[PDB]
PDB file of C-alpha atoms and ligand atoms in Angstrom:
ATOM      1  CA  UNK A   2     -18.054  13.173  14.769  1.00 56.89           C
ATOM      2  CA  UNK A   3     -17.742  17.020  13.085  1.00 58.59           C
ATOM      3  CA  UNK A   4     -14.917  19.277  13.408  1.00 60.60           C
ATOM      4  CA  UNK A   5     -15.470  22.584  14.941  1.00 60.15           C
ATOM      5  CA  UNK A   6     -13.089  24.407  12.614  1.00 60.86           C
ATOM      6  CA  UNK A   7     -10.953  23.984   9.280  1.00 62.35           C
ATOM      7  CA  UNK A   8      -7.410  26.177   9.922  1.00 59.55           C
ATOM      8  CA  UNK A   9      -5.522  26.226   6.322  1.00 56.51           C
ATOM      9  CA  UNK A  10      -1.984  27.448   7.064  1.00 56.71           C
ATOM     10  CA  UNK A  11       0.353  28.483   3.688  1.00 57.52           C
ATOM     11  CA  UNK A  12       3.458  29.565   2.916  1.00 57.74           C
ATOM     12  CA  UNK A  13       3.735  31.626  -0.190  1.00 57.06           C
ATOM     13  CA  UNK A  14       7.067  32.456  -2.179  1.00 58.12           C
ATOM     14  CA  UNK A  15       7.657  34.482  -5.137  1.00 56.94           C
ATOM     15  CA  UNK A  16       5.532  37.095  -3.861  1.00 59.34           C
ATOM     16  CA  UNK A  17       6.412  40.446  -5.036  1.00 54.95           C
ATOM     17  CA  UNK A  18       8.265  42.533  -2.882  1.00 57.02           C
ATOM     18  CA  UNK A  19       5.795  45.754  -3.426  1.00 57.26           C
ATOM     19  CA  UNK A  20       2.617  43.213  -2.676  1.00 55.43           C
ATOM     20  CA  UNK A  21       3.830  42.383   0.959  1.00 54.58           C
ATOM     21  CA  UNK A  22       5.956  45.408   2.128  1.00 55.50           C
ATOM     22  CA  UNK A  23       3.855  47.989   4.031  1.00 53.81           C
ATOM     23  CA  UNK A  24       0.813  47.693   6.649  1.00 52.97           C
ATOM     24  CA  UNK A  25      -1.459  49.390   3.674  1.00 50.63           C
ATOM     25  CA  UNK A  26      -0.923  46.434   1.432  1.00 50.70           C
ATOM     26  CA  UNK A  27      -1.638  43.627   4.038  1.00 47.22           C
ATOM     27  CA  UNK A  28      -5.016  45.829   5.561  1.00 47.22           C
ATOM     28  CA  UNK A  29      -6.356  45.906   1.850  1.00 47.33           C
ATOM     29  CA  UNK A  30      -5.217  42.489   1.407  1.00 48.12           C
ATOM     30  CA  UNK A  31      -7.305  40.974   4.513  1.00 48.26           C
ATOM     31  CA  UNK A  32     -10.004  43.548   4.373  1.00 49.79           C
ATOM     32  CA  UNK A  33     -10.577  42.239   0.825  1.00 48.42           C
ATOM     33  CA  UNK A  34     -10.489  38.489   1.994  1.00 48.13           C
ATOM     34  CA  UNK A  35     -13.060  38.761   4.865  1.00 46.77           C
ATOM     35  CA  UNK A  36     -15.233  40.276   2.556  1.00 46.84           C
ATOM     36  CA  UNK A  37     -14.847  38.162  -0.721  1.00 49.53           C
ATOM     37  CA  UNK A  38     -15.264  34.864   1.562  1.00 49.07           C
ATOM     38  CA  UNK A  39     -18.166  36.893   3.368  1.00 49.99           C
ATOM     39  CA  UNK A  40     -16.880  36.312   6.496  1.00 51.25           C
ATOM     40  CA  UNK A  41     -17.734  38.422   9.303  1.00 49.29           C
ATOM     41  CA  UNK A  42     -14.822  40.255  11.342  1.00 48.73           C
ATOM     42  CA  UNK A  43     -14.890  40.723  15.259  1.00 43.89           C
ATOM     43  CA  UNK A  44     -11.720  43.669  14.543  1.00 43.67           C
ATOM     44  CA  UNK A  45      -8.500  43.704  13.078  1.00 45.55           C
ATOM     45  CA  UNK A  46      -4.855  44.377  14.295  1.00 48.27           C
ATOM     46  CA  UNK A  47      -2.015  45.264  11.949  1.00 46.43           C
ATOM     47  CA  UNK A  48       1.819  46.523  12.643  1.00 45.25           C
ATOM     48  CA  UNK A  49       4.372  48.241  10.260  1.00 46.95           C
ATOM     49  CA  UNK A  50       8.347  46.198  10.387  1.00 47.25           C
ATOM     50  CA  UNK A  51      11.174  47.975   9.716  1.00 48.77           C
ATOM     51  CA  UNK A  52      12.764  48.347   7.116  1.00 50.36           C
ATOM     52  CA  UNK A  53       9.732  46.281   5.968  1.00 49.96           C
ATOM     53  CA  UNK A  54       7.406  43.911   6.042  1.00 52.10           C
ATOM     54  CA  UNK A  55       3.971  43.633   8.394  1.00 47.29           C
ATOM     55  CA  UNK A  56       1.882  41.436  10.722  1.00 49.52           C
ATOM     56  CA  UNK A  57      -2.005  41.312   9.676  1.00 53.30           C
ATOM     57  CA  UNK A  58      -4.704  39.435  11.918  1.00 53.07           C
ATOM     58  CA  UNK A  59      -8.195  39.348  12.363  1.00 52.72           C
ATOM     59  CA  UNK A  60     -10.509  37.999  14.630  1.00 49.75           C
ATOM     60  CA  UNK A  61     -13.741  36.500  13.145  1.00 48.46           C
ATOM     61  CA  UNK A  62     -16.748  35.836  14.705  1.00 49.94           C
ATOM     62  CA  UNK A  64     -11.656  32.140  14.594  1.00 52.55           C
ATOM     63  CA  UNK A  65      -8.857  34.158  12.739  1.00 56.53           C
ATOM     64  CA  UNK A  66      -6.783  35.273   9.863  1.00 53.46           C
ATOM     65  CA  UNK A  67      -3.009  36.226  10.092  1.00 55.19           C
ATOM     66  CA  UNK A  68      -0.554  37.293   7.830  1.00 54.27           C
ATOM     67  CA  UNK A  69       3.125  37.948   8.580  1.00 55.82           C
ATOM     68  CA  UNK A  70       5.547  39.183   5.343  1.00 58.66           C
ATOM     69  CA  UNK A  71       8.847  39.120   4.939  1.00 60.36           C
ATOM     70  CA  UNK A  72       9.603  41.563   1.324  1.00 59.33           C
ATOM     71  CA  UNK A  73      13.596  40.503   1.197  1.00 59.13           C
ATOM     72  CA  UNK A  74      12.457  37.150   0.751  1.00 60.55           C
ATOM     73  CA  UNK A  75       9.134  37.443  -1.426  1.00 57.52           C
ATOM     74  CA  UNK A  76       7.765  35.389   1.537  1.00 59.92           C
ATOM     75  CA  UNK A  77       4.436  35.814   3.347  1.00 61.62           C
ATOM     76  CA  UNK A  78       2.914  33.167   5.928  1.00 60.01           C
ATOM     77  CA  UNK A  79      -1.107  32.956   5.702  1.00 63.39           C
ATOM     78  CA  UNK A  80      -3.584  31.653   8.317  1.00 64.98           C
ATOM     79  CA  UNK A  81      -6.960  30.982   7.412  1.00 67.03           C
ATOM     80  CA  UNK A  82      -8.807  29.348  10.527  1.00 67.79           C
ATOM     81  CA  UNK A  83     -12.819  30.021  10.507  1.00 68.85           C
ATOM     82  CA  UNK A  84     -15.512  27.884  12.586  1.00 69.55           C
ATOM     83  CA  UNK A  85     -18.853  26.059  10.752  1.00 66.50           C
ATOM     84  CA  UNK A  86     -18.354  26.866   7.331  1.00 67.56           C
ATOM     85  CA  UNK A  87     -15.299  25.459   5.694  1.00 66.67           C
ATOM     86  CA  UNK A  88     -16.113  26.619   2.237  1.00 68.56           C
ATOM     87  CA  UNK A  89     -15.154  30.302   3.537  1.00 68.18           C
ATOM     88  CA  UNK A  90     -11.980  29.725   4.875  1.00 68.79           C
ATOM     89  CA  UNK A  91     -11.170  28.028   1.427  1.00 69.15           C
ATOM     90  CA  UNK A  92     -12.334  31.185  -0.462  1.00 68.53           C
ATOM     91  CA  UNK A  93     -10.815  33.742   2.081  1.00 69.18           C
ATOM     92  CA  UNK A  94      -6.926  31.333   1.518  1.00 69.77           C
ATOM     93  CA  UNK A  95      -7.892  31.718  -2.909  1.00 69.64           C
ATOM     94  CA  UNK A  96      -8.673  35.728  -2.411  1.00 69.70           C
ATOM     95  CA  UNK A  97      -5.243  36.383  -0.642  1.00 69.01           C
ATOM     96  CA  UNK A  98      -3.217  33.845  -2.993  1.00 73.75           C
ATOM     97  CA  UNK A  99      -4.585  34.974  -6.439  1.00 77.52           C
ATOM     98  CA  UNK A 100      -4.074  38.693  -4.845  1.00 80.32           C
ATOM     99  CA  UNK A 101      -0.546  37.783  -3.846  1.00 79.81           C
ATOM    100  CA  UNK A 102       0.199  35.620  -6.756  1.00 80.66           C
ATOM    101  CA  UNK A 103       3.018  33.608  -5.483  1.00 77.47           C
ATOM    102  CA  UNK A 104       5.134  31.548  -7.392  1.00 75.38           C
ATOM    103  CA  UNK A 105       5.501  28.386  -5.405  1.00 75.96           C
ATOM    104  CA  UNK A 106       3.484  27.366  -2.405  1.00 73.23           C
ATOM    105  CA  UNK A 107       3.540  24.922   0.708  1.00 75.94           C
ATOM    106  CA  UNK A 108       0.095  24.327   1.966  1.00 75.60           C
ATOM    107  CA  UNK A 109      -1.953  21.982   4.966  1.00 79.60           C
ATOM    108  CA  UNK A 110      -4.890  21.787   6.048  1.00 78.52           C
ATOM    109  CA  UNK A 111      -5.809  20.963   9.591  1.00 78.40           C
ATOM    110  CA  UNK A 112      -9.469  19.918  11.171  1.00 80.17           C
ATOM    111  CA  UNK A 113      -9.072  21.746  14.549  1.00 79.19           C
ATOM    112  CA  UNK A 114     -11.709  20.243  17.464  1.00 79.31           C
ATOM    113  CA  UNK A 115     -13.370  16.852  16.376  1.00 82.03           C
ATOM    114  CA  UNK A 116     -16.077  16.333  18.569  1.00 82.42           C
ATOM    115  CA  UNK A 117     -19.034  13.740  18.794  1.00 83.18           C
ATOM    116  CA  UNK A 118     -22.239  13.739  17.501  1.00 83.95           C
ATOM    117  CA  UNK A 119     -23.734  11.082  19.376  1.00 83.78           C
ATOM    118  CA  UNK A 120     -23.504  11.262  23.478  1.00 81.73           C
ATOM    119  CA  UNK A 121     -23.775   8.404  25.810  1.00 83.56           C
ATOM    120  CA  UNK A 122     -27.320   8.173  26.720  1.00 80.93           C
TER     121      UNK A 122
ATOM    122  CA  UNK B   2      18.923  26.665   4.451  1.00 79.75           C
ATOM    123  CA  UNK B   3      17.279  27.771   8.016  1.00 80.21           C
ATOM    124  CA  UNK B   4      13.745  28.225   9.127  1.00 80.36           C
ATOM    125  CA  UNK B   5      12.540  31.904   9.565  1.00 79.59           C
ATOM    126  CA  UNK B   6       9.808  30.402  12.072  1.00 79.47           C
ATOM    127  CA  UNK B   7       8.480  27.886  14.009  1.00 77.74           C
ATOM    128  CA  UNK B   8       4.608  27.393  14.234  1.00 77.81           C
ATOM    129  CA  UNK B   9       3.073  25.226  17.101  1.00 73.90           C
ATOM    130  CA  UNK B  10      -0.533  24.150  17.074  1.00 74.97           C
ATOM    131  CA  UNK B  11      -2.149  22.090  19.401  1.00 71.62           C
ATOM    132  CA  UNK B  12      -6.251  21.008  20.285  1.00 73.42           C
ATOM    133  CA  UNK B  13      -6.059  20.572  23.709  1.00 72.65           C
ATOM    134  CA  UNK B  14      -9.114  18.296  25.190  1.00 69.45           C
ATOM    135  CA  UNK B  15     -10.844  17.569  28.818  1.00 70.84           C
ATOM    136  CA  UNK B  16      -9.867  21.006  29.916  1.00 75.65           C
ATOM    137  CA  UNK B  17     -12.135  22.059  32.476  1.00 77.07           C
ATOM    138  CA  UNK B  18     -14.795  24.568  31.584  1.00 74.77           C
ATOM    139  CA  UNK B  19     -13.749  26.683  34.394  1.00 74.93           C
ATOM    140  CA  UNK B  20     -10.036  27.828  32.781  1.00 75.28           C
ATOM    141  CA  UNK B  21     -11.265  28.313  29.618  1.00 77.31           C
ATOM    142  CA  UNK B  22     -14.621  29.866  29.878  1.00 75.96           C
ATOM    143  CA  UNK B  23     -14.283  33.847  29.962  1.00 73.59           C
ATOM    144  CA  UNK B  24     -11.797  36.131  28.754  1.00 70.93           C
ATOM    145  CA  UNK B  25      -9.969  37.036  32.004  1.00 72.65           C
ATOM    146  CA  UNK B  26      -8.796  33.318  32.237  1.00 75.80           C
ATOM    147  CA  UNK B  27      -7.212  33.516  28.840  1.00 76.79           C
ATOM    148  CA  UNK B  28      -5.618  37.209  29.233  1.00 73.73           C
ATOM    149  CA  UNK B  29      -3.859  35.843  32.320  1.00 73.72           C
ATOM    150  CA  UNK B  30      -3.008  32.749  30.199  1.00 75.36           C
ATOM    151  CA  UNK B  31      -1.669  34.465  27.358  1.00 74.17           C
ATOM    152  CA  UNK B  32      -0.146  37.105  29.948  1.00 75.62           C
ATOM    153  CA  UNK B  33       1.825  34.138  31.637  1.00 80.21           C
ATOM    154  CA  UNK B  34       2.763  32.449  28.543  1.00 77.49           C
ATOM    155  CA  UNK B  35       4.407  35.319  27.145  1.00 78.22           C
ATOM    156  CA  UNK B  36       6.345  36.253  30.193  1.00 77.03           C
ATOM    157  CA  UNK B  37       7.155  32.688  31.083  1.00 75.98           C
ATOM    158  CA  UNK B  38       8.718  32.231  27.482  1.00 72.07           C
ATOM    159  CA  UNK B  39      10.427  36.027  27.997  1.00 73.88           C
ATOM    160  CA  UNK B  40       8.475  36.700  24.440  1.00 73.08           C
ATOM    161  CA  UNK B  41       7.557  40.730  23.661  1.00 73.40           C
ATOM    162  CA  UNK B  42       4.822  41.441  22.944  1.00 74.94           C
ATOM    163  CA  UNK B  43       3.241  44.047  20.458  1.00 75.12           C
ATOM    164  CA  UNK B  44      -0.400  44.131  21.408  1.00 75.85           C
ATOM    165  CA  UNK B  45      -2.759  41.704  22.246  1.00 73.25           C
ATOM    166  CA  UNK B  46      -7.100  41.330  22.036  1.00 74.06           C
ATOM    167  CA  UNK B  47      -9.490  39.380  23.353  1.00 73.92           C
ATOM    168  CA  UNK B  48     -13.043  38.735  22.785  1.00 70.09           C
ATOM    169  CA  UNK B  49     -15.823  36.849  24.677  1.00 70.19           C
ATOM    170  CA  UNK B  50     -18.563  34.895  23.484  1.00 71.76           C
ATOM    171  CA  UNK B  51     -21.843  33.963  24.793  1.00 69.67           C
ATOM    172  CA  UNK B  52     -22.739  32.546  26.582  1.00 71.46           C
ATOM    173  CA  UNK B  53     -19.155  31.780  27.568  1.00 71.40           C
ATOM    174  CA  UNK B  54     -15.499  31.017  25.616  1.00 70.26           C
ATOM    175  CA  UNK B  55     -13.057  33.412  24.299  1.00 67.74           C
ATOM    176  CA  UNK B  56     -10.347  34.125  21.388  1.00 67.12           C
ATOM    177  CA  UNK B  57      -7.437  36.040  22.551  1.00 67.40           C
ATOM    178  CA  UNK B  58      -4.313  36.465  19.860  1.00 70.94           C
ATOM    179  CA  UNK B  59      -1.207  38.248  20.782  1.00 72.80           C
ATOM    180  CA  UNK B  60       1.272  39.977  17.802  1.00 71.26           C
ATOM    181  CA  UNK B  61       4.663  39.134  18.906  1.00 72.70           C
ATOM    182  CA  UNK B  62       7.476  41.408  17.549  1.00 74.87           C
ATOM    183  CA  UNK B  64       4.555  36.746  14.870  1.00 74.82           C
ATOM    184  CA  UNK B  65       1.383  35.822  17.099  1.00 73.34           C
ATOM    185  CA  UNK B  66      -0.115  33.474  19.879  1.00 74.25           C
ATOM    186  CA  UNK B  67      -4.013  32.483  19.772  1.00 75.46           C
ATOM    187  CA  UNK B  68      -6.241  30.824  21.514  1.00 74.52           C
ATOM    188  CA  UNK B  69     -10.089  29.755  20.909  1.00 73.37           C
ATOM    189  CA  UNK B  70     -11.933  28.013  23.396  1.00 74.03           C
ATOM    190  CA  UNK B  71     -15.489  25.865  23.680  1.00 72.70           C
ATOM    191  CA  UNK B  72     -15.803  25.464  27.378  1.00 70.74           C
ATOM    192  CA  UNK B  73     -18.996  22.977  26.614  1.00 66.78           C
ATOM    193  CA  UNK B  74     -16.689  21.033  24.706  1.00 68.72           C
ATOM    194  CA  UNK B  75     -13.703  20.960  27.483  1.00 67.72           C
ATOM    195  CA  UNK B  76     -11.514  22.159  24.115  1.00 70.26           C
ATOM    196  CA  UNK B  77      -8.963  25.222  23.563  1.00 69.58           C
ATOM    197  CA  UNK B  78      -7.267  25.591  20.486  1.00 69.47           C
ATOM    198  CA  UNK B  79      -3.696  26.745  20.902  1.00 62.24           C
ATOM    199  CA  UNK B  80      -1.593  28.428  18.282  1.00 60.44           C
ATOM    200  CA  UNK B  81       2.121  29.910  19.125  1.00 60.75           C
ATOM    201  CA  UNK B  82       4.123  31.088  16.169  1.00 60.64           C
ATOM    202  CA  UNK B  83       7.100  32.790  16.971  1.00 63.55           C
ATOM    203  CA  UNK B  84      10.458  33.705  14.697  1.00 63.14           C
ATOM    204  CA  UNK B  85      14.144  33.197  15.337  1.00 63.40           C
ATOM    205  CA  UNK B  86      14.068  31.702  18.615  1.00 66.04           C
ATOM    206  CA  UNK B  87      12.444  28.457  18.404  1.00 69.89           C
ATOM    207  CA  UNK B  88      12.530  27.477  22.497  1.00 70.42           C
ATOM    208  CA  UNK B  89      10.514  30.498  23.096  1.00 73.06           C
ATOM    209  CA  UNK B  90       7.549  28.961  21.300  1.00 71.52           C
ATOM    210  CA  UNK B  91       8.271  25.833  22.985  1.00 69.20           C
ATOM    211  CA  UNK B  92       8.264  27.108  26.329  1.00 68.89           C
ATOM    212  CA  UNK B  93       5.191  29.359  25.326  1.00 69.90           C
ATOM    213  CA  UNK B  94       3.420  26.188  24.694  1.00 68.75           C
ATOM    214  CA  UNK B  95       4.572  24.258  27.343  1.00 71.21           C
ATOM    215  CA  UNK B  96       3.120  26.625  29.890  1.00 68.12           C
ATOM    216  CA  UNK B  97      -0.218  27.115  28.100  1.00 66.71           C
ATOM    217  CA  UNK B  98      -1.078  23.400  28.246  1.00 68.36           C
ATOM    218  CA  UNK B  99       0.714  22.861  32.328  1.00 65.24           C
ATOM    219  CA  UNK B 100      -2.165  25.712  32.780  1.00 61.47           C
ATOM    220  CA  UNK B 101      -5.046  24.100  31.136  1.00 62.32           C
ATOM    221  CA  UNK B 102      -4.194  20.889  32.062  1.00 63.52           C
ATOM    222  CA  UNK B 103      -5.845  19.277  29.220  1.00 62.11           C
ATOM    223  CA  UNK B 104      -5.912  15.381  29.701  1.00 59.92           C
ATOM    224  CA  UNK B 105      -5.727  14.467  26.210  1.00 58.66           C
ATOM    225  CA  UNK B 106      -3.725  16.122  23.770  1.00 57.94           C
ATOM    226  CA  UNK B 107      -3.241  16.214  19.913  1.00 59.05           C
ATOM    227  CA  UNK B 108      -0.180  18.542  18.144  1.00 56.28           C
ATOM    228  CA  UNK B 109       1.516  19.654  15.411  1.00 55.49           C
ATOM    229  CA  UNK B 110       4.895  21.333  14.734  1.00 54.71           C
ATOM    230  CA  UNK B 111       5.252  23.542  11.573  1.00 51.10           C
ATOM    231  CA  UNK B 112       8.683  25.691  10.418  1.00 50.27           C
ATOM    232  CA  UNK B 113       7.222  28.001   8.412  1.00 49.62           C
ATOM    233  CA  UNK B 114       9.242  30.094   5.753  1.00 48.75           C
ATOM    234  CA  UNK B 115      12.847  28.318   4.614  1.00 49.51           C
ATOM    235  CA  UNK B 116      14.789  30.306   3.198  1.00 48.81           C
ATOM    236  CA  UNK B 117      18.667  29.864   1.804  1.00 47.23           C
ATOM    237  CA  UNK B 118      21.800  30.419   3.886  1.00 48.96           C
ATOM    238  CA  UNK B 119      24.148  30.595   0.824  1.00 46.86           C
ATOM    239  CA  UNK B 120      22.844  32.248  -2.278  1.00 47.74           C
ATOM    240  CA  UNK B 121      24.499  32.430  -5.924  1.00 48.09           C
ATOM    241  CA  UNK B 122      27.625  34.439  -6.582  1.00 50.95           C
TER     242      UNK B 122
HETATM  243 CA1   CA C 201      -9.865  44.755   8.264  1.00 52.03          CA
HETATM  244 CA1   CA C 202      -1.519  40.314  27.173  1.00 50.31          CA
HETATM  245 MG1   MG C 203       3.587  47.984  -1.361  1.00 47.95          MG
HETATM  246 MG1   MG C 204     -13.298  30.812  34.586  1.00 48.30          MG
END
């Protein structure tokens, strides 16, 4: 049996305020992921909160989303890819050294387990 | 301390091919999820695959997904939402009624806690 995806889901605190607070920060942010983890990007969607704070995702050819929350130094990272596990992994370390939080809650979920042998 | 959002996952299994194989099946979907639940929506973007299956993610003003392997009878299911928790719920619940997946396995995240009282 093999999964079909790894999704890593984190929650990062202690993240500056002036990291996570506009759509510019979270576009870099992603933009820079996808390409440090050399994964390959179908488009991307972003939107600008008020006062603060923005949504992020992208659609890979599974998907990366970021939603930030500056009043509480709080951002909430997705990292689900399909095949190659070490990429999500490197895409989740780009976006937490870049965001340096203090504390972190993180899980990891195998996402489609399917078999390798059929019934002949 | 309260949760600023709730995060449902789910691998849904034995779905038949025919609900989850292009991208007009999971645009209505997603469509009827979000109205069912009375969610708004910001945008949403789909994407077909070949030779069949589909992503579709909706930002919520956090987001909805969906991935799907019709060869493999398999959708992956994603609804985060924040604030009001029996939206996702209901979100959820009428994704899976639609797909009708005969074997099911879930996860329930809250994602972000943050403190109610903070220091005078
Ligand atoms: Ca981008
Ligand atoms: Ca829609
Ligand atoms: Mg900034
Ligand atoms: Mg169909």
């Amino acid at each position: 049996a093999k999964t079909l995806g790894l999704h890593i889901l984190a929650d990062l605190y202690g993240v500056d305020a002036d990291k996570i607070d506009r759509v510019e920060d979270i576009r870099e942010l992603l933009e820079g992921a996808v390409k440090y983890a050399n994964l390959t990007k179908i488009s991307s969607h972003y939107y600008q909160f008020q006062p603060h704070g923005a949504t992020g995702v992208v659609l890979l050819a599974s998907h990366i989303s970021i939603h930030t929350w500056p009043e509480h130094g709080l951002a909430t990272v997705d990292v689900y890819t399909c095949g190659d596990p070490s990429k999500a992994y490197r895409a989740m370390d780009y976006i937490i050294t870049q965001l340096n939080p203090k504390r972190i809650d993180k899980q990891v979920h195998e996402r489609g387990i399917v078999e390798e042998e059929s019934n002949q």
